[PDB]
From a paper:
For the investigation of the binding mode, we solved the complexed crystal structure of SaSsbA with 5-FU at a resolution of 2.3 Å. The individual monomer within this complexed SaSsbA revealed the characteristic OB-fold structure, featuring a β-barrel comprising 5 β-strands capped with an α-helix. Within this complex structure of a SaSsbA dimer, a single glycerol molecule and one 5-FU molecule were encapsulated. The positioning of this glycerol molecule, designated as Glycerol 3, within the SaSsbA–5-FU complex closely mirrored that of Glycerol 1 within the glycerol-bound SaSsbA. Residues R18, P21, V52, F54, Q78, R80, E94, and V96, positioned within a contact distance of <4 Å, were instrumental in the binding of 5-FU. Based on interactions discerned via PLIP, the four side chains of R18, Q78, R80, and E94 were observed to form hydrogen bonds with 5-FU. The electrostatic potential surface of the SaSsbA complexed with 5-FU unveiled that 5-FU effectively occupied the groove within SaSsbA, a site significant for single-stranded DNA binding. The positive (blue) and negative (red) charge distributions underscored that several critical basic residues on the SaSsbA surface, which are exposed to the solvent and collectively form a binding pathway conducive for accommodating ssDNA binding ssDNA (gold). This complex structure insightfully revealed that the presence of 5-FU in the groove potentially influences the wrapping of ssDNA by SaSsbA. Notably, a substantial conformational change was observed in R18 upon 5-FU binding, resulting in a shift of its side chain position by 7.2 Å and an angular alteration of 77.4°. However, intriguingly, our complexed structure revealed distinct 5-FU binding configurations for SaSsbA and SaSsbB.
Single-stranded DNA-binding proteins (SSBs) play a crucial role in DNA metabolism by binding and stabilizing single-stranded DNA (ssDNA) intermediates. The majority of SSBs adopt homotetrameric configurations for activity. Diverging from E. coli, which harbors a solitary [name] variant (EcSSB), certain bacteria like [name] exhibit a more complex scenario with the presence of three paralogous SSBs, specifically referred to as SaSsbA, SaSsbB, and SaSsbC. Of these, SaSsbA may be an EcSSB counterpart due to its possession of an acidic tip and sequence resemblance to EcSSBn.
Numbering used by the authors:
A (entry chain A): 1 to 39, 45 to 104
B (entry chain B): 1 to 39, 42 to 104
The structure:
Amino acid sequence: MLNRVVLVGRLTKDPEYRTTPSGVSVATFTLAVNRTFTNEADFINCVVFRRQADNVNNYLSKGSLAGVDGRLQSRNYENQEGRRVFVTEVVCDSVQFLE
Amino acid sequence: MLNRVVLVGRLTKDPEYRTTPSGVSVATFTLAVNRTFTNGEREADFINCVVFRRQADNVNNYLSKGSLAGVDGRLQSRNYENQEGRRVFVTEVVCDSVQFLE
Ligand SMILES: O=c1[nH]cc(F)c(=O)[nH]1
């Protein structure tokens, strides 16, 4: 079914590397996406698969402007405090490096 | 900045329909959005949506568990403390429009 999300925002921190529970490598970063209206940003976790993870970790850093096109994915997991965390993330088909 | 979400899916439950403390209609539901790829089995994503005003009224009046719907909106994050004292991070789709597809 149709699942498409597009964002332009600035990274809140330097991107990271991580391995999925199944051992697949990804890059992760958080995008601060300023709203168009007035009463503020939204903070959206993004996930890049395969070698695109290397472009993300080398070209972007905290404050970099980026654009993402991808799909929204839900998952959940138990954190270290033994707590069930529910997340909705953008799994990126492409990341555009705007600056 | 650019922030756009489009989804087609089916409601996992009857929408929840209420009037906020500002006086606006509010509707919430979870859209089960099937993935295009397959594992052979095909998995789904479960996206929390919220709609306000006339679109909320329409959602309550026409959508029910299992209904096919299309949403066009924006992705919003927020924070809250639960009664256990834990910070909970919320990501949901705030719908500008809902399309009824059945
Ligand atoms: O962050 C993630 N994105 C997609 C996945 F399939 C997963 O396991 N973890």
